Symmetry: C3
Subunit: 272 residues, 3 copies
Amino acid sequence: EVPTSYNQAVRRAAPAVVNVYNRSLAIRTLGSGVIMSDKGYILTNKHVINDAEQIIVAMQNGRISEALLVGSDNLTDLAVLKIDATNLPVIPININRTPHIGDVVLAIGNPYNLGQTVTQGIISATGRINFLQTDASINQGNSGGALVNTLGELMGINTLSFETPEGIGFAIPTALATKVMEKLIRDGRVIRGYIGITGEGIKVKKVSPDGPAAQAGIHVGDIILNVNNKPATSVIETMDQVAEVRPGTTIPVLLLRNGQQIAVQITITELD
Amino acid sequence: EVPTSYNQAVRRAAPAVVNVYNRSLAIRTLGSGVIMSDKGYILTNKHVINDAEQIIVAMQNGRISEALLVGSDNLTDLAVLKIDATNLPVIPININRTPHIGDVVLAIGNPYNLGQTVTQGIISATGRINFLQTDASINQGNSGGALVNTLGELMGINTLSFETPEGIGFAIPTALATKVMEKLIRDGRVIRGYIGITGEGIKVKKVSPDGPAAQAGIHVGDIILNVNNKPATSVIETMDQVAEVRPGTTIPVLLLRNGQQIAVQITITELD
Amino acid sequence: EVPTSYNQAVRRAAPAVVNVYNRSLAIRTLGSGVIMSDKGYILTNKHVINDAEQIIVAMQNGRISEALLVGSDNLTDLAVLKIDATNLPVIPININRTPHIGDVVLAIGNPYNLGQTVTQGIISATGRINFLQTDASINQGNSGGALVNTLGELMGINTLSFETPEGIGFAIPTALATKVMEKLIRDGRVIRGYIGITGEGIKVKKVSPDGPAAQAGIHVGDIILNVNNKPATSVIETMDQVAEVRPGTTIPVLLLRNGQQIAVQITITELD
């Protein structure tokens, strides 16, 4: 008796989704952003704001503001902007809502600078490399905008679209995005731990010179066994681990060097 | 317990959506149409029927009829056809239903001459230049067909689809489409008012020769202030206004000509 | 109050949708498959497994198995695989569920070897040449996977995707797919009847040499009237009929040969 509609989601979330314009000596590129906090913090993708000399944020209520850059993270392609904090709409965030495959979602952004657009699809996959996959159509200009469920709750920040493939696009999920945002607000960057190692236990195909591995006693050909008390079998898994250790933290490692077992103290520096 | 389906919408609306074939000395192009009235009036897009020597309408019940052209409008890309009025299904129209962003919609038409197809998406934007935007997939052959909500009510007439962009397509909304239809039925064309002016108050970059501006006392460089008692600041806004005035209507205008204020009577002719 | 989701369908059906890898002397091509029976029978598309030297099936629970080929059918592009039958999830099948235009559907498969993906759309058309059409996005890798409704019931086996067309993709409907599967299990192929005739009653533009028509007394130019007691007007209709007759079945036919009516006994062989 009533038409099926996700307009309530749109009314809840779209006022917090902004149009982001990267200007330099006119518009160099453009995209979208999401108002995360009533203090004026906005998430967007780093590739939207790269090389900006001036960052303009336009709200759907027609307010236009200049933005400051709080910080950015190349590894997640996120950036935080800050605008004047008066009477801002904020995106709905439900910290208890896990994105499930098949959840209906809406992507909200500014594809082709047509003005704010809302497209619909579902959560197609999760865990993709930390990505959500979706077939809500995402186009150039959508980057940095919101993927929301039918309650308007933020599911992720839309980032990129994959014969021409159809209906394959990706978003950084909310939990990760918000964690990156908080680190950027606090530290002005995402502090990750670094070890100077390229690998495929794990073989050190290459040590990094000036790399806490080399300057620790580690050399090529080794097999690392334990990294800070944890077996080190998979590279992504082990690099994810190392990322987590604070810099200036002094960890034990365990290596095999020609059929013997030498524990190594390496001290974690900050990744560049 | 029951599968989710919009089949009721399809059962209500698809019998009124036709396949339109533009023939000349075999098929030159094809598209779709919508039966608007039980008297046999059909909306389609003008680009579907341009240069037709014969217009064939096929209904989903297998009836095939030849159509007459009632009229067409280049500015909205609409045309009205007329077929024999026996026992026709008519599209549902709810004059009170406003299309809202996020409303689920179905596009019904004949993409690639595959036979009648129904695709699903949402209302993505409204007000686009008077367009609805949708991510219900629209392809070549869909032009002229129906965009309906999940009750089967007509939301608009599908017109065109915008790396390859995905999920961006446009429809003329029902209220506008029906207004154009009524004018075409009544007058055989859409009568618009015309003033001979190109502008960007508003500067007259160019007067049109034989243009009621020039033949009224208006000249290049002027700034027009008021058009028929209304400030004239924006061009689209002011051209939309002029369009509305009936031809042979004699309106006051107000211009600035070198720091003085001369009221001008211009008489509105019909646009070609 | 609850987000709209088709996750229940995904939880019911996706565990039975597999990733299929065609290996030869590394991966030659890949796609998807559907577990049809707890005995280990899997449907996929023939084009996925063509020329395979080894067929690997990966389940979403991480089990990896080698598959045997039960048989395949070029005309429907289907194949049946067999894996070890321990504790398999099976796709939901409702023999009473007819696919209706507008039914919401989910396509489940392995596009671009991203890992199992679920996309959403509707049933766009049925009866297409026996195909379902859908705008659930289908990409390279989806072939052989499941199209399910929102209860998780199998609607069809996804086969191929049709300016770039958007949202046009095809699946073999469940009833047909299951019938082909049963014939492949039973006979190792789909046994069809054959008559040696190319036509457009029906004119025999070409007889097939060694073709039960020619070796029956039939010749070019004839008009066939009745095929086994049924008027023979349409070619698809009449070829569909002939397909149904078992080989070694001896049927009457009726032909016109220059204004006279000669009944012909032809004996149906098996198509190659």
